[PDB]
DNA sequence: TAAA
């Protein structure tokens, strides 16, 4: 029962969701977006942030889109491969935006703020896909973030993912980057860390005086 | 200050705290009508501080465009006789300069930019610096720490004024839209969240998470 | 929903 768990009170109502996306070169506005994945959490009856919901889409260059090679060698993605399963950015964007409503609701969110690594990046293709679909109640915060990078190099004293998820013990494959969906589960995982070691170390929640 | 634990703190990293004021929310079109930097450094025990503060008030650059919305929010008139403004380049040379000798002098290799929604300042300080065709930029290209997802973090609170006043800090809304009371009380809060880890123990890390 |  989401309303009696502490996910609502540990980021003033925001619901943090997890995002990773991959794309044709380094311009939301002008270069395609071809995969995205997301990632919805949950707080368990300890109070420890976890995993909740997945989703993982593959995504049609929109009208027009530029696709730089580089990008297409980095991220090892053939825009035209038959097993894409490419769907629209309406649709995927649709079908993560109901989902994270309906956890937003369910759990006593008022609106989601994305978790990303550098996490500008991904917002802005986000935004810049939804602007492009013409999707509305957009539950997404319009230009505030919680970027991993930022939060491990205060945690971890590191900013690159890779460095960040070792340092913080867990397993990182060098093959398995960069999947949008393995990019997200790790980043996911490392930032439910970075929470739950805060809450372990008693830097969670905050003491009387500091109730202001 | 290369004896210092700065250039270890962030793999050598040199966090600059910025805050600017602007006439609106585009980067690219409107105009960048304040800036203040703050460098930090840490003390013999292992603190973090504020070191060193620029503050400077910019000319809108060629062509800017002028929000009236955003000139009556930060309370600005471009027009001000006593606003001693200066140029995109000026204003950014000074700052890049100072910057670059911290970085040498505490042993970092680039500069990282700390900012409150950091993604905003970040966004105007690099167009100011390509309009200008500022070289040898020592700011990252795209990484910057945003004290609203590290207070998100430390303090339960992304809006600055609550997350200042949360960490126990003094937060005067008149004083709020000067770039250099903004940037100064984001230095404190920065300061403060890296600080409090380490009181509670969470840094350094223990000897099973070196990699 | 607060970076102007
Ligand atoms: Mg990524
Ligand atoms: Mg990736
Ligand atoms: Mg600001
Ligand atoms: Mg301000």
Not at 156 to 160: A, D, E, I, P
């Given at each position: 029962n989401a309303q009696l768990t502490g996910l609502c009170d540990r980021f003033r109502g925001f619901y943090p969701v997890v995002i990773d996306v991959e794309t044709a070169?380094?311009?939301?506005?002008?270069?395609?977006?071809l995969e995205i994945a997301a990632i919805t959490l949950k707080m368990d009856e300890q109070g420890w942030l976890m995993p909740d919901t997945t989703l993982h889409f593959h995504v049609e260059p929109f009208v027009g889109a530029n696709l730089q090679p580089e990008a297409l060698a980095f991220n090892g993605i053939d825009p035209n491969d038959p097993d894409r399963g490419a769907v629209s950015e309406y649709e995927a964007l649709h079908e993560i935006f109901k989902v994270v409503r309906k956890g937003i609701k369910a759990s006593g969110c008022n609106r989601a703020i994305m978790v990303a690594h550098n996490a500008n990046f991904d917002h802005s293709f986000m935004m810049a896909a939804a602007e492009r679909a013409s999707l509305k109640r957009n539950p997404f915060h319009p230009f505030a973030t919680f970027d991993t990078a930022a939060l491990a190099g205060l945690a971890?004293?590191?900013?690159?993912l890779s460095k960040a998820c070792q340092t913080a013990g867990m397993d990182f494959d060098s093959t398995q980057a960069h999947s949008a969906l393995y990019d997200t589960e790790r980043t996911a995982v490392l930032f439910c860390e970075i929470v739950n070691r805060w809450k372990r170390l008693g830097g969670w929640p905050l003491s009387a005086a500091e109730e202001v």
């Open positions: 070169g380094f311009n939301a506005k002008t270069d395609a977006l971890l004293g590191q900013t690159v």
